[PDB]
Amino acid sequence: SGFRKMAFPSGKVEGCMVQVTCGTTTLNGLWLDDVVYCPRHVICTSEDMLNPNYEDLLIRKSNHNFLVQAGNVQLRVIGHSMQNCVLKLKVDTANPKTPKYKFVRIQPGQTFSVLACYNGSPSGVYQCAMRPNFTIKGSFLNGSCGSVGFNIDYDCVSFCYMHHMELPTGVHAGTDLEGNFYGPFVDRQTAQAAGTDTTITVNVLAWLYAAVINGDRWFLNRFTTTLNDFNLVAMKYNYEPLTQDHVDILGPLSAQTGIAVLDMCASLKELLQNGMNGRTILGSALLEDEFTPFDVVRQCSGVTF
Amino acid sequence: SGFRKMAFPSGKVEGCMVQVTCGTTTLNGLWLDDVVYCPRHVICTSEDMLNPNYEDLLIRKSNHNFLVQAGNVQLRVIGHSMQNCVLKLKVDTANPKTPKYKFVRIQPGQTFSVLACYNGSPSGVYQCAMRPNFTIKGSFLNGSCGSVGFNIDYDCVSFCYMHHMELPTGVHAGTDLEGNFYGPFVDRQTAQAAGTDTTITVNVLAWLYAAVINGDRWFLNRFTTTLNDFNLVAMKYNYEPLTQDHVDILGPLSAQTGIAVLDMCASLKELLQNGMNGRTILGSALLEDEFTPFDVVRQC
Ligand SMILES: *C(=N)[C@H](C[C@@H]1CCNC1=O)NC(=O)[C@@H]1C[C@@H](C(F)(F)F)CN1C(=O)[C@@H](NC(=O)OC)C(C)(C)C
Ligand SMILES: *C(=N)[C@H](C[C@@H]1CCNC1=O)NC(=O)[C@@H]1C[C@@H](C(F)(F)F)CN1C(=O)[C@@H](NC(=O)OC)C(C)(C)C
């Protein structure tokens, strides 16, 4: 029993973290086989950030301008190239600690673990959901760029995120491992607005099932609702519209507790209109939306890697 | 910017997790040098648990009744001894992945990372605080016993907790790595009550500093308070009394922000008396007490 925000064990990702220095900028790099991936803004000076021409900036750099350090040993850069917003530095040594991996582009609503790093040394691990407006609510300071987001499938690490910048709301933005930003953001220090955020309805439903499995039952009522009727309420409270795909994804949890998805939607519908009235659910005074139906199932089956 | 409940990187501890089986019971063990540490209740049947005589039960077990596995490698058990509520299994191989380590008994109010494990394999990592009543609010299922709590200081792993059981209220109990339970608990399946819990006042203040460093400042008022008057209010709302030692520990945060501890206690006094009025601090609708001043400084 008990329900907690839990991150994947970071060991396999810790063995891939290196420090990448160019000029006065020092950030983190991901060393897989004989390539070190890092954000391309590492080649900028504080002034360049305002409006960089990355192609021209990279032309002025050579392999000797990139100081790559794996622990106490310096790695030699023998080639460099730019793939979207990512810099790929070829090194002369392949990472002997390279795990089985893949590069994946996650969807909004999906979660991942972030291994926050500074000077190529891991400092902490936490779980994030990719918000519907393609930002993340992380904890990142100067030097944290190049820190990666990932999920594990027993043996294989699916790298889905690399940290690049922080936006007005204190929210974070970054790319997949091919350098394509999530959202409408650019790696330039100019004002940029993230869209209006929305609550991940399917994740709130998943978390209400986790509450039932754990003994928190007070919010359960005898009503049901239509996917269409519920969406009229969800739109008023800024919740993402619920689809049949979402209902099918929630099937395993619904089957385990014997509570139908439309029945849980009716319980959620009343929680949005009447509020929680000072009561808590799983130790929280708000409705949580950063647990996927898969995060809940994993923590209700003991899935190991 | 951003403030998150963050666990330490688990790689160093993952290399120490092994599977320990005794009869039909399978749980986790901690392999450091040539010794595997695990809960002593691994030797119990579902029947023994109700009222175990561990001394008599362990007498009936030999080294061969303990199967220890690290990955697909079988470690040969060549010795066994019981220290308090912990079993120490001597194996024929020293763990080559043994980090620099120490065993620590943490104080109530302090935090640690838990590497949750099943079948000797790591499942996930989360941060916990040892409550004033010596329980933790974890996420542990059947087979999670043996999973450990730890802190990391650069290269050294300070192991502070080993999971043993779940209490009537859904909370968790366990021992330090010497087998001594935190709190009044015993490894027997009988009803046991954890005391009335209290809020960790020094941690709530550290979290208020974290909020100000992040731009959440609506709760900051122009008032100040004394230690004696703040403690009169804190007593009413079931908070631990704030001491000069607590004020001293808040020093680095107080200096980094330029906000006196007694000015922050006036903000906290008004938050307790008037309530939060549906507002949030760092995305939370309640006052959080599971971040120590050190946890906050580490992320600021
Ligand atoms: C990477 N090491 C940092 C991480 C950043 C530091 C403060 N909080 C964080 O998360 N990344 C940067 O400093 C980027 C690099 C520049 C750019 F993104 F390429 F343009 C600007 N940086 C920013 O994050 C800026 N954000 C911004 O311009 O967003 C539009 C700020 C935070 C203003 C320095
Ligand atoms: C260890 N693998 C489990 C962990 C437990 C299972 C569900 N969630 C958990 O935290 N530990 C146990 O099953 C212990 C072993 C027995 C004893 F502690 F040695 F006595 C009893 N177990 C319990 O946790 C029981 N709790 C209990 O009796 O508390 C007083 C329960 C959870 C009732 C099986």
From Swiss-Prot, chain B:
Portion of the full-length sequence here: 3264 to 3563 of 7096
Quaternary structure and interacting proteins, as annotated: 3CL-PRO exists as monomer and homodimer. Only the homodimer shows catalytic activity. Interacts with host FBXO22; this interaction promotes the proteasomal degradation of nsp5.
Topological region Cytoplasmic: 1-300
Catalyzed reactions: TSAVLQ-|-SGFRK-NH2 and SGVTFQ-|-GKFKK the two peptides corresponding to the two self-cleavage sites of the SARS 3C-like proteinase are the two most reactive peptide substrates. The enzyme exhibits a strong preference for substrates containing Gln at P1 position and Leu at P2 position
Domain Peptidase C30: 1-300
Active-site residues per Swiss-Prot or TrEMBL entry: H41 (for 3cl-pro activity), C145 (nucleophile)
Top-rank lineage group of the source organism: Viruses
Phenotype for K90R: In strain: Beta/B.1.351
Location of this chain's protein in the cell: Host cytoplasm; Host Golgi apparatus; Host nucleus
Residues joined by cross-link Glycyl lysine isopeptide (Lys-Gly) (interchain with G-Cter in ubiquitin): K5, K90
The protein's name: 3C-like proteinase nsp5
Effect upon mutating N142A: Does not affect ability to cleave and inactivate human TRMT1
